[PDB]
Design a protein around this nucleic acid. Sequence first.
DNA 1: ATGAGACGCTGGCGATTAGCTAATCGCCAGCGTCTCATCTTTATGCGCC
Length: 65
Amino acid sequence: GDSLHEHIANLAGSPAIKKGILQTVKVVDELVKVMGRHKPENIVIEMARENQTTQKGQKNSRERM
DNA sequence: ATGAGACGCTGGCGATTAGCTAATCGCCAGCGTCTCATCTTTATGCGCC
């Protein structure tokens, strides 16, 4: 039992995220609901995870000694 | 076997008399700490269907 709301407010972390999530999810639901009430071909999203190099990633995480 | 019907300075002043939002800008915003624990999550480091 998780409604279209609630489940978002059942997530882990800070409430700063819950607002944004509720916004984007309701936007997506409306987007599919407008364009013929049928699911689109693809949905592309942007992720904050980028690929750093080995040298820099080991240089910043090099234990102090 | 006669005695009613016919009605004004106002407009254009002053001069009281009375009364009201709005546009511009500036100021200035309760805050101080610690303890205690609690969980996460991240950077790096190790494995083949």
